[PDB]
From a paper:
CRISPR-associated transposons (CAST) are programmable mobile genetic elements that insert large DNA cargos using an RNA-guided mechanism. CAST elements contain multiple conserved proteins: a CRISPR effector (Cas12k or Cascade), a AAA+ regulator (TnsC), a transposase (TnsA–TnsB) and a target-site-associated factor (TniQ). Here we reconstituted the approximately 1 MDa type V-K CAST transpososome from Scytonema hofmannii (ShCAST) and determined its structure using single-particle cryo-electon microscopy.
Because particles containing 12 TnsC protomers were most frequently observed (73% of particles used in final refinement) and yielded a slightly higher resolution cryo-EM map (3.5 Å versus 3.7 Å), we refer to this configuration as the major configuration. Aligning both transpososome reconstructions (major and minor configurations) on the basis of TnsB reveals an additional TnsC protomer (TnsC13) next to Cas12k in the minor configuration, which contains an additional TnsC protomer compared with the major configuration (12 TnsC protomers). Comparing the two configurations, the specific TnsC–DNA interactions in protomers adjacent to TnsB are virtually identical, since the same interactions are made at the same positions on the target DNA substrate. At first glance, the TnsC–DNA contacts adjacent to Cas12k also appear similar. That is, the last two TnsC protomers in both configurations interact in the same way with TniQ, resulting in a translational shift of TnsC–DNA interactions. This leads to slight variability in the number of base pairs contacted by TniQ (5 bp (major configuration) versus 4 bp (minor configuration)) and TnsC (30 bp versus 31 bp, respectively).
Residue numbers in the entry:
A (entry chain S): 2 to 88
B (entry chain O): 2 to 144, 173 to 406, 412 to 635
RNA sequence: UAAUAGCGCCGCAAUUCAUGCUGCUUGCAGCCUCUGAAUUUUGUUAAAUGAGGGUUAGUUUGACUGCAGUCUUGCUUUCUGACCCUGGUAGCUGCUCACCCUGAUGCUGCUGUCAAUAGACAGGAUAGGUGCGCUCCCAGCAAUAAGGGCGCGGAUGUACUGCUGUAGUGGCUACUGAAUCACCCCCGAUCAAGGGGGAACCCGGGUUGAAAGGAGAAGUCAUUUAAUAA
């Protein structure tokens, strides 16, 4: 999981305000940060079954948050997809 | 009659690495030739109807793949190994699918035929006695019986009077006076519905898969799933089912179906050596215990005897039949050809060891070859008849071999073996003309000094099943079971039963027609559980877990095979019969042997 | 302190016969000295089973020829013995927790010493409960079965381990510590390789624990853990 400094850094950049402790922008971005650190270890440690359970959960949460945001506000959804480099 | 023996093969790296590269490259056209049938072939459903693969189709898909830029680097015998394996994959899977189709139809009949006594009265517009009288007429006509009554319902609807033919069939081809409980009938008719449902589910099977070593689909899916967003729950789960899949680490084995495509020799150091057709640069050294060496010396003696005799003796009687070359998985780190272990598995027909046994195979093949030539009687077909007639002539010229008189047993003395859940075996030796049991054995006698091993097997199954549960919750790789102990116990009983058959000069060993006990129990416990937990499907599955699990762990097919193998190596005939539903394990064994004796005529 | 009960095994004791023991009537009479089946009983320095994790191309189960002489190979497994350990730091990574109640196929349970902090040190497979074990039971913990209660902030168009967080417990890779044995001791080789020196006993030769094998491919089933979903 992320360092304390790394969470504070991510929440301050994707949060709409410093007090925006849990917007979808924040949650999706944090998940994207974790997933980007976990694919670099899981491509090397191919025998590490316990980490594939962690990855498949963490990707599936990201998708639910994104589907919710898409219907809620397509402009927020489009910007968030850009800022995270997703397709 | 056949057995498999084995040795590890030793060579220097360059040879174990070159062979790996050919098998990692050969493993791939074993995948592509599956796909060329799995989805490419248009006739596929005609094969599923017939239950058999056409004898040339895999070769006709492989021949143009021999020049493929991906597959072209391999010897002519490695392509025949590919064609062999893919032929045997499909030739097995289609034959599984056909027996399932036949069972589903063969019970869809019976779910239509099975009616309550009140339904027969309504359907006939007549009395249940009129039905008993017509059932008595139908038995008088018939006297193949159960089949003849099934056929007489499939034919001969007879103004619905086939109602009485169903009355016979549900009563086990006999007349019955009693009138049945509709609750017992409801359980009975529900078991058939469950079997029908289960068969309509199992009717669809996963199209036989190739062993992909590349990880390419898995790596592509990983980078897709982590960098892109799925458009559907079905797509997000499609990536999950791929990412959870464990990939293979070993290529398919080479199969050498011609015994002469292995060449044997003796090394300067006195060790035995082998080489394969198309790999004749790569000499390998045999390493095996002296408990098995006598076959590997016999391989070289069979070969030298033919070569010393200007090919006038045939490999139609060579002790080696076919070889399967396989990489057994090693442990720890290293390149695959330094980590895994080349092992050569030789199929051997054990009755070729002796001269008296070789003469059986000479007569068996000479009769089969003679019939083949007379069934055949075109250009290459004449060349095939030249192969056959050179065999039919050469097979009469004998190898110098060990002599041992054949076993002979008394045609009236039989060993009955009774299998069950609590007693894996129990034995009665019957003199069938005296109607006299010569001896009985229970398990405590039937493996003697080893009787502690049954208690060990039950402790180990229970202990290890709990440890596997605890280990899975922690994602530990440690996953172990009693399978090799169960295999040893089934072999101890197989030796003791045949030693007992030899002791009393028995003419045969009798084994029960157990059939598919696992599916039968699964349907019976479900039809019952649905009456005790209606609507609560989780409670229905929990109803008798330990009984259903103990039936799925019951090794009856492996004990039946272990006895068959050891009996046929000794020369004792195997016979079969219905095992009684009631009586003690001894009475079951007694009546089983007497039933198999009564079935002689 | 506690663990009374339930369930599975292990013998011990009968009681009933036989697949057994004496006869000739080759099928009866007779009993339980053995060898075995069935029921019921038991927990007695009775007897018998008895899963903390690991270690040898180990020994014996082998082939051929008339029980004697030749040849012999180190494969895949099941036990019985014996010995060793109860681990080390260097990264990567999963899960779990605001705080409470219920407490799960949940974790933990040995001897001795110092602390009496939660942990070190030295012993060790006798290691919570019984003759021996369990998903059962007792004791402590319980966030990491599950359900319910519910505080402040973020979001609030259905998404929300999504906040209150530095520890707990796993997974994997690289290096490393001990045993690398089959009567002990010593020097080596692990796709190969053996050799040298002793103790004990039997009648200068042996002995110094036994046993099994028909192998591959593919589909399918049952339970059992994870993930997703309604």
């Amino acid at each position: 999981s992320l360092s304390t400094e790394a969470t504070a850094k991510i929440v301050s950049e994707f949060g709409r305000d410093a007090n925006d402790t849990g917007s979808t922008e924040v949650q999706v971005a944090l998940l994207t940060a974790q997933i980007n650190h976990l694919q670099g270890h899981f491509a090397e440690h191919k025998k590490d079954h316990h980490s594939r359970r962690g990855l498949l959960r963490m990707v599936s949460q990201r998708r639910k948050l994104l589907d919710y945001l898409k219907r809620k506000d397509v402009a927020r959804y489009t910007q968030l997809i850009e800022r995270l480099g997703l397709r | 009659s056949q057995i498999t023996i084995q040795a590890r093969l030793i060579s220097f790296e360059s040879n174990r690495q070159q062979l790996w590269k050919l098998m990692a490259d050969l493993n791939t056209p074993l995948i592509n030739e599956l796909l060329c049938q799995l989805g490419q072939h248009p006739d596929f459903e005609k094969w599923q109807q017939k239950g058999k693969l056409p004898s040339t189709v895999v070769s006709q898909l492989c021949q143009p793949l021999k020049t493929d830029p991906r597959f072209a680097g391999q010897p002519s015998r490695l392509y025949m190994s590919a064609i062999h394996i893919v032929d045997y994959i499909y030739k097995s899977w289609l034959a599984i699918q056909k027996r399932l189709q036949q069972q589903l139809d063969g019970k869809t009949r019976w779910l239509e035929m099975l009616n309550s006594d009140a339904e027969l009265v309504e359907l006939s517009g007549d009395t249940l006695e009129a039905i008993r009288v017509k059932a008595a007429e139908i038995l008088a006509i018939a006297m193949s019986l159960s089949k003849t009554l099934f056929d007489a319902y499939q034919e001969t609807e007879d103004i619905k009077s086939r109602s009485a033919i169903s009355y016979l069939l549900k009563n086990g081809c006999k007349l019955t006076d009693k009138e049945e409980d509709s609750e017992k009938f409801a359980k009975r008719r529900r078991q058939v519905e469950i079997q029908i449902q289960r068969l309509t589910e199992k009717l669809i099977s996963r199209m036989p898969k190739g062993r992909d070593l590349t990880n390419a689909k898995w790596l592509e899916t990983l980078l897709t799933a982590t960098t892109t967003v799925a458009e559907d729950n079905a797509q997000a789960k499609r990536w999950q089912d791929i990412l959870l899949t464990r990939s293979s680490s070993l290529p398919f084995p080479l199969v050498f179906e011609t015994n002469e495509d292995m060449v044997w020799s003796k090394n300067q150091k006195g060790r035995l050596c082998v080489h394969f057709n198309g790999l004749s640069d790569l000499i390998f050294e045999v390493y095996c215990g002296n408990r098995q060496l006598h076959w590997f010396q016999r391989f070289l003696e069979d070969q030298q005897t033919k070569r010393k005799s200007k090919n006038q003796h045939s490999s139609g009687l060579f002790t080696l039949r076919n070889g399967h070359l396989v990489w057994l998985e090693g442990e720890g780190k290293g390149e695959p050809w330094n980590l895994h272990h080349l092992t050569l598995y030789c199929c051997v027909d054990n009755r070729l060891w002796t001269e008296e046994g070789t003469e059986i195979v000479r007569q068996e093949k000479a009769d089969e070859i003679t019939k083949f030539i007379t069934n055949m009687k075109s250009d290459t077909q004449q060349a095939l008849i030249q192969r056959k007639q050179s065999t039919l002539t050469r097979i009469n010229n004998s190898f110098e071999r060990p002599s041992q008189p054949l076993y002979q047993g008394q045609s009236h003395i039989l060993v009955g073996v009774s299998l069950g859940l609590e007693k894996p075996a129990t034995v009665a030796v019957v003199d069938a003309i005296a109607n006299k049991v010569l001896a009985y054995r229970s398990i405590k006698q039937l493996l003697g000094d080893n009787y502690e091993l049954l208690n060990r097997q039950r402790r180990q199954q229970q202990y290890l099943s709990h440890e596997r549960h605890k280990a899975q919750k922690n994602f530990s790789p440690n996953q172990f079971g009693a399978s090799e102990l169960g295999q040893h116990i089934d072999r101890l009983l197989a030796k003791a039963i045949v030693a007992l058959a030899r002791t009393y000069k028995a003419g045969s060993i009798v084994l029960p027609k157990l059939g598919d006990m696992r599916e039968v129990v699964q349907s019976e416990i479900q039809a019952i559980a649905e009456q005790k937990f209606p609507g609560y499907i989780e409670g229905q599955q929990k109803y008798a877990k330990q009984y259903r699990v103990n039936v799925h762990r019951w090794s009856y097919g492996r004990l039946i095979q272990s006895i068959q193998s050891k009996a046929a190596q000794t020369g004792i005939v195997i016979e079969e019969g219905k095992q009684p539903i009631r009586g003690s394990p001894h009475d079951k064994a007694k009546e089983l042997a007497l039933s198999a004796y009564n079935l002689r005529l």
